[PDB]
From a paper:
of transcription factors found in prokaryotes. N-terminal winged Helix Turn Helix (wHTH) DNA Binding Domain (DBD). two Rossmann fold-like sub domains (RD1, RD2). conformational changes which modify LTTR DNA binding sites promoter region DNA.
configuration formed by the association of two symmetry-related dimers. apo-DntR above, the conformations of their IBCs to be very similar. suggested, acting as mimics of bound salicylate.
Residue numbers in the entry:
A (entry chain B): 88 to 300
B (entry chain A): 89 to 303
Write the structure that this text describes.
C-alpha cells in the first residue's frame, strides 16, 4: 500500500497491559498530535481472544509487553528492560530509601495480583525467596495503587515505570527494591505478514524512537 | 461475635476499577484505626461466577450497578453519580460549562467500559445524534488522567473518578453538555450473610463512609 501520516485516517489497534496503556499512551498521543493528527488509535488487553489469530488477520497491528506466547510468524523487538521498585508516600512515618529487607518485611503491603502478565510472578517470587509480607490489601490491577499509597502508610512493589508515572501526581517516593528481583523485558511484537507494510512500519519506528533505550 | 480491633479475617469485595480507585483509599484509611489486623482483597464483578461466590461466602460484598443481583440479594443505595466532562486545566480552548458545540468540535478519548453502566455512554451519545472525533479508544479508565494531562483531548467520565484525578493530574471538569442519565451506585450482600456480625459491621462502615443519603 502507501502511507502519509499527515493525511492518513487509518485506525491502528494496539494490544497492551493496563500499565502498558498508562505508560505508552500519553507520550504516544502527545507525539501523534504533531505527526499524524487524523489517524485513530484503539487499545485492548492481550487476553481478549484471540491475539494470534487477530494479529494474523490484521485486526491487531502491534502488541507490547512480555507476551511470551507469540513466537513463530512474529517479529519482535525489545524496547526496554524495567526493574521492580518499592514505592510509598513521601511523608511516610518510617519508610526509607534505600529500604532494608527487614523493614520491608516489617511494614504492611498492597499486592497487585496482576494475573497473566509478567508482574504476577513477584507475589510468588517473594514467597519462594522466603520473604514474609503482611498483605493488608490485595487488588487485581494497578489502577488504585497511587490513590491508596497516598492516603495510607502502605507500601507496594511495582515496576519502575509505574513508579515514575505516579511519583509526582500522588506525592510518592520510591526505593531500590530490598529483594533480589529479576528485570522484565518489554518488547514490541508485530506479525510477519505486515513486516513491510508502510503504516505498520512507521508506527513501529515511532514506538522505537519514543520508548526504546 | 466480631471484634474489629482483634479480628484477622479476610474480606473479599467485588468492584469495578473506578470503584476500586474510589472506595479503597478512604476505606483502608479508616480500617487503619478500626480494624488494623484484618485483610482486604478485591476483584472485578466479571471474574468468576459472582452469585455462586457470594452465596458460598467467597465474596462478602459487591459495589456498583450490578443489575444481575436480584434475588437472594439485599442491596443498599450508597449514592447517585452523574457523568462529567474532563480535560487538562491549561487546555487551549476547553471551557466549563462546556457547550455541546465545542464538545462535538473537540477530540475525545473513549473508555469502552464493557459490562458496566459506563458502557452505554458511547451509544447514548450516538443515538442522540452527537458526533465525536474518537481519537483514542481504551478499554478501561486507568490511562485517562495521564493521557488528558499530556494531550488536548477531552473525556466523558463519572463524577467521582473526576474527583480523584483533578488534583493529581491538574485536570478540570465540566457539567456534561449532553443529557445523560445518572448511575445508581449500590452496596450488595447476600441474604445468607445479612445477620453475620462481621459482614454487617463492614456494611455499616461502607454506609458511614460513602452514603450520602442523609445529606
Amino acid at each position: 500500500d502507501s502511507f502519509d501520516p499527515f493525511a492518513s485516517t487509518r485506525t491502528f489497534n494496539l494490544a497492551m497491559t493496563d500499565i502498558g496503556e498508562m505508560y505508552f499512551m500519553p507520550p504516544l498521543m502527545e507525539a501523534l498530535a504533531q505527526r499524524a493528527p487524523h489517524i485513530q488509535i484503539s487499545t485492548l488487553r492481550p487476553n481478549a481472544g484471540n491475539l494470534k489469530e487477530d494479529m494474523e488477520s490484521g485486526a491487531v497491528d502491534l502488541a507490547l509487553g512480555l507476551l511470551p506466547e507469540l513466537q513463530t510468524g512474529f517479529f519482535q523487538r525489545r524496547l526496554f528492560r524495567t526493574r521492580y521498585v518499592c514505592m510509598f508516600r513521601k511523608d511516610h512515618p518510617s519508610a526509607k530509601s534505600p529500604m532494608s529487607l527487614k523493614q520491608f518485611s516489617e511494614l504492611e503491603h498492597v499486592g497487585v495480583v496482576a494475573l497473566n502478565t509478567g508482574h504476577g510472578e513477584v507475589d510468588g517470587l517473594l514467597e519462594r525467596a522466603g520473604i514474609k509480607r503482611r498483605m493488608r490489601l490485595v487488588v487485581p490491577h494497578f489502577i488504585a495503587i497511587g490513590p491508596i499509597l497516598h492516603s495510607t502508610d502502605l507500601i507496594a512493589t511495582v515496576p519502575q515505570r509505574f513508579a515514575v508515572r505516579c511519583e509526582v501526581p500522588f506525592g510518592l517516593t520510591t526505593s531500590p527494591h530490598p529483594a533480589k528481583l529479576p528485570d522484565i523485558a518489554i518488547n514490541l511484537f508485530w506479525h510477519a505478514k505486515y513486516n513491510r507494510d508502510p503504516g505498520n512500519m512507521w508506527l513501529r519506528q515511532l514506538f522505537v524512537e519514543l520508548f526504546s533505550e
